[PDB]
Design a protein around this nucleic acid. Structure first.
Lengths: 257, 177, 133, 148, 125, 142
RNA sequence: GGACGCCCUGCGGCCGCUCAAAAGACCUGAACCCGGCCGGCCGCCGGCCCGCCGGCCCCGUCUCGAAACACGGACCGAGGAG
RNA sequence: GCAGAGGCCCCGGGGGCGAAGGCGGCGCGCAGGCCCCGCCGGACCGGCCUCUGGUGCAGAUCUCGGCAGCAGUAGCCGCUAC
């Protein structure tokens, strides 16, 4: 691109800038010239894919799974979970092959307001994305995890729903837009098999548990920590400058006599 | 105009707070800041800085080093703000109580098999906030490889090793090469 | 979601096909909902529009019933009798308003003999599908 | 990435961190490590001792696997014994049933003696030994052995 | 009506205009720091135009406060206006330019219910 | 510059002209699929037979790897004699045969003759039961 | 894709018409520049009702030093370089 | 501040009851800038968190397009002529 033409600098004495010019005298072969090359042409040698350590990929998938268990983190991510009876939500499904039957489970389990928020959020995107095979955006909502159940067909056409096997959970799904807290509907096979999947990681040991702010705040107000505290000396008194001779009280405060 | 440049030496920079994304290290530092402010004790001031130190300035302390560094003070509790690793070379670990930011899986299993206790700064903050019966220990900062090539290899008093392969004689054979 | 890699979801390729479709494809792209009465008799939901079919427009603009006398395949529109733009002067040749086949319901079909065969083929295939494969 | 980079913060500053008096010009000091015994002598002598010249004899083809010598220290020979086996071995001590460690099967050819062996007899079999390793292993009551 | 407040002292009344904006249309009036090797503006010689500095910064008590005495929160939906209602006596509402005259009537009625001032109430009318 | 290790990177050659000396790996996730399909197609072509032939256990070369054994190319004629199979017969029963390889050690013949015996028990030469046979996947005897 | 009527030697003009809209050879319709009408004596910064008073050299740039009788720059718009 | 990507925007963000753009006017910010209002315009557009870059112009005898003042100016003088 931009280099397919034959252009040479006209020279140094023709009252023209020294940029390369075509036979007619037309600017060519430069970033500032119309039809010229990019100064630094973009190239496929860019590293498109980064690298992550398996222990670090598996830390995130586990931490995202844990974030799903919090019904405050789940509500912060946007998902509507008020009707949901309990988080984590496990549902004894069988083989659900009908969207009509899946909706009845989504309603009874209590995620309907969330699967409706997504349905009623389809819209044409802002930008040239609309022209680039990215025209419609729908809010993400529930994610069904399945093991040994045919729940794919019924829950797939439902909108804003995503489906994952317990054998290959996907971080991008667990934390949509780098936000942990996805409302996940779990089949009773998947939730029972989650401890088997973690065991099958050959030598993985789950990140050891750590405490939260609430535990630290409780410790700082604990009998031992509070008792050790010493009360500091009383603060210094400052007071803005006053000329003593202006006020007898100011003089009295400086020299009482 | 005032002259506050003819005796003033410029201001230095420290790591007042941690640069770690890890939310746990930040929560421990905020808590120890509270204890130091609430009781102005050296153990809490030293530990608040150690948690704000960088990974390079916080070196690993193995259970072999910890045992030697605690031979006389066995009753006391160690408090490294760093990972405690294992020396497979010491084949009989003694019993000791160690508070560390992280313990290797082998160090935790060696210590508790031996009969000790692997604490954590949250347990330290409740049990011993001002570090009573606690010795804070540190690993050797100079141990790193990067730290051994710091200097000018090439000067007569360098005592430093050249960075790359070199494979040559002019300057390496002696003081007159 | 489409699971056939060979079908294209590209706006450009889909719109290139629509505006460059062969006349056989263009004709089936120009189909209208058969009327509830005609649907029951022929047991098929939509038929491609043809000259001499009587259609009723449900769309609010230029809405009426009439016979298609002209199919403008190139602009994918049909001309219904009665659907005409206001003339500048009373004594002038009527100009038809072009209506999209989609905007109308087919009240009556020009039956012919090929259409009788075509509506039968479609209903035989629809029988195999309705027999749950 | 590019947004967080410093170069983006230098827009509106003309030379962009390269100086008005002398700016960014192509290759001002030369291309590569060129000028080391001349204009850049101070750098090659200050930080790069030994860069210029030929040292010892040359092997036209090095046999990397014939010149390969993995080494183990007397300190790390009980690491090779697994934990469950190691604690009982130490307690029993014993001469008739004392652990035979063949460092070759763990991939080590010569035994050096950096640290201290635990005080219990152990037989160590290797391709070669160092005197201090042999003396520390013989003090513990152990026997150095050669392996086929 | 807002809470009473302290007189809003604007240190400068006029906008900071780039140097030589008057001579050229290529130079638009936006502030660009003067960085010329021989710049009268950067040297701050007598008769040059002001230079943007943190000194002209307003009291942090009244910064961002509209002449009415309230701070401005842009509202684009009736749910968003319910945060302005959530215990706000120091804030006022600006409906966006996008909201239609059909939607403004609903937002004005909700604001009327919760006693929130709307800055552009007379819009689209 | 200052204290740095001199780079041992060779300068890029033929960058804008000549042979394409840059390779790109965007075909990597597709290549896995193409070769998996090829192995599935070859496996379908011979359902009872395994994809790979029995190959010998050989000591990895050099002292660095002497105490470790790896799959080799073919069983020697001397090893085949131990199981009493001809070169042509062994090839028919999916056993790779290497005429060039010479045994080297008595211990090598013994390990390899044992291999063939374990395979001969496993092999089920067939001259609809074929459909119920289970095709072996991967290296035969690993 | 421009009804009618009026005017004109004709061209064309006017009145409108078709349309949601002329959108009229074409969507939007910026700046530079220009014409009609209306206001003003006119550069920038400050104080005042506002035309006075006071201040103010042409930027960019290499340069010890540029308002330089150093060099580039009529104007505008888009493109234009870690 | 720009242009995209992944999310959010309490019944599922704002839009022919008027999107972007354009023109004029307030307000807000030390400032880059932002916001609203009126008018034109006629289908799209964001705020925030995360991510990404061909990401900001007064200059380069800059490129390409428009185009001014000079200026109704220089000129419209071979070949005898109507």
């Amino acid at each position: 691109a931009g280099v397919q033409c034959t252009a040479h600098s006209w020279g140094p004495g023709r009252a023209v800038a020294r940029l390369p010019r075509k036979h007619g005298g037309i600017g060519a072969y430069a970033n500032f010239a119309r039809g010229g090359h990019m100064a630094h042409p973009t190239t496929v040698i860019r590293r498109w894919c980064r690298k992550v350590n398996l222990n670090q990929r598996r830390y995130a998938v586990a931490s995202a799974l844990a974030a799903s268990a919090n019904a405050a983190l789940v509500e912060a991510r946007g998902h509507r979970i008020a009707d949901v009876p309990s988080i984590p939500l496990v549902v004894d499904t069988d083989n659900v092959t009908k969207t009509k039957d899946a909706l009845a489970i989504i309603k009874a389990v209590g995620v309907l307001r969330d699967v409706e928020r997504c349905k009623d959020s389809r819209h044409i995107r802002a930008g040239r994305g609309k022209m680039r095979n990215r025209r419609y955006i729908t809010r993400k909502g529930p994610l069904v995890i399945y093991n040994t159940e045919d729940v794919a067909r019924g829950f797939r056409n439902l909108p804003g729903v995503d489906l994952c096997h317990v054998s290959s959970i996907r971080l991008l799904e667990l934390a949509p837009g780098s936000h942990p807290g996805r409302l996940i509907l779990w089949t009773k096979s998947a939730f029972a098999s989650l401890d088997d999947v973690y065991a099958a990681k050959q030598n993985y040991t789950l990140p050891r548990s750590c405490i939260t702010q609430t535990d630290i705040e409780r410790i700082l107000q604990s009998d031992a920590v509070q008792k050790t505290f010493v009360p500091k000396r009383d603060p210094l008194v400052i007071e803005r400058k006053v000329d003593p001779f202006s006020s007898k009280e100011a003089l009295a405060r400086l020299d009482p006599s | 105009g005032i002259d506050l440049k003819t005796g003033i030496k410029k201001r230095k920079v420290e790591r007042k707070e941690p640069k770690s994304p890890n939310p746990y290290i930040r929560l421990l530092h905020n808590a120890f800041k509270v204890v130091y402010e609430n009781t102005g004790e050296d153990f809490t001031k030293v530990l608040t800085k150690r948690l704000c130190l960088s990974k390079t300035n916080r070196p690993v302390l193995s259970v072999s080093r910890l045992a030697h560094l605690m031979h006389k003070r066995e009753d006391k509790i160690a408090v490294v703000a760093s990972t405690v690793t294992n020396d497979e070379r010491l084949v009989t670990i003694p019993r000791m109580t160690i508070c560390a930011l992280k313990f290797s899986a082998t160090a935790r299993s060696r210590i508790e098999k031996a009969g000790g206790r692997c604490m954590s700064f949250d347990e330290l903050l409740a049990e011993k906030p001002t570090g009573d019966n606690c010795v804070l220990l540190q690993g050797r900062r100079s141990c790193r490889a990067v730290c051994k090539k710091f200097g000018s290899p090439g000067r007569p008093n360098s005592h430093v090793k050249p960075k790359g392969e070199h494979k040559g004689r002019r300057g390496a054979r002696g003081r007159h090469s | 979601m489409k699971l056939n890699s060979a079908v294209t979801a590209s706006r450009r390729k889909c719109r290139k096909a629509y505006f460059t479709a062969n006349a056989e494809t263009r004709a089936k792209m120009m189909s209208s909902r058969l009327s509830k009465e005609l649907r029951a008799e022929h047991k098929i939901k939509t038929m491609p529009i043809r000259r001499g079919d009587i259609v009723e427009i449900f769309t609010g603009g230029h809405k009426g019933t009439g016979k298609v006398v002209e199919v403008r395949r190139r602009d994918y529109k049909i001309c219904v009798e009665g659907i005409n733009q206001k003339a500048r002067n009373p004594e002038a040749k009527p100009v038809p308003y072009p209506i999209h086949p989609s905007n109308c319901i087919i009240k009556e079909l020009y039956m012919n003999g090929s259409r009788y065969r075509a509506i039968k083929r479609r209903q035989e295939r629809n029988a195999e599908r309705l027999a749950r494969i | 990435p590019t947004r967080i980079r410093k170069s983006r913060k230098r827009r509106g500053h003309r030379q962009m961190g390269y100086g008005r008096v002398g700016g960014h010009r192509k290759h001002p000091s030369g291309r590569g490590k060129a000028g080391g015994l001349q204009h850049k002598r101070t750098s090659f002598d200050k930080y790069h001792p030994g860069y210029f010249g030929k040292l010892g004899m040359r092997n036209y083809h090095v046999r990397r696997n014939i010149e390969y010598n993995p080494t183990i220290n007397i300190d790390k020979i009980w690491s090779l014994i697994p934990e469950e086996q190691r604690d009982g071995f130490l307690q029993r001590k014993s001469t008739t049933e004392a652990p035979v460690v063949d460092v070759t099967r763990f991939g080590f050819f010569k035994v050096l003696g950096r640290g201290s062996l635990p005080q219990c007899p152990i037989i160590i079999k290797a391709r070669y030994f160092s005197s201090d390793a042999e003396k520390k292993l013989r003090e513990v009551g152990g026997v150095p052995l050669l392996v086929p | 009506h807002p809470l009473p407040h302290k007189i809003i002292i604007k240190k400068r009344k006029n906008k900071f205009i780039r140097f030589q904006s008057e001579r050229f249309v290529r130079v638009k009036p936006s502030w660009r720091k003067p960085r010329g090797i021989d710049s009268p503006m950067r040297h701050q010689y007598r008769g040059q135009r002001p230079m943007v500095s943190i000194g002209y910064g307003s009291d942090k008590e009244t910064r961002f406060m509209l002449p009415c005495g309230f701070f401005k929160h842009r509202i684009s939906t009736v749910h968003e206006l319910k945060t302005l209602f959530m215990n706000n006596k120091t804030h006022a509402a600006q409906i966006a330019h996008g909201v239609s005259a059909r939607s403004r009537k609903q937002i004005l009625e909700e604001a009327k219910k919760m006693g929130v001032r709307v800055l552009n109430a007379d819009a689209k009318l | 510059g200052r204290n740095v290790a001199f780079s041992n990177m060779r300068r890029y050659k033929c960058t804008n002209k000549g042979p394409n000396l840059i390779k790109n790996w965007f075909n990597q996730p597709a290549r896995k699929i193409r070769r998996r399909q090829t192995r599935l197609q070859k496996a379908k072509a011979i359902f009872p037979c395994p994809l790979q032939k029995l190959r010998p256990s050989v000591t990895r070369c050099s002292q660095k790897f002497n105490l470790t054994q790896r799959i080799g190319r073919g069983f020697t004629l001397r090893e085949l004699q131990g199981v009493g199979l001809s070169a042509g017969k062994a090839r028919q029963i999916g056993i790779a045969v290497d005429p060039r390889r010479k045994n080297k050690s008595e211990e090598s013949v013994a390990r390899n003759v044992a291999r063939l015996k374990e395979y001969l028990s496993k092999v089920t030469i067939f001259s609809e039961e074929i459909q119920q046979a289970i095709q072996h996947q991967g290296v035969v005897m690993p």
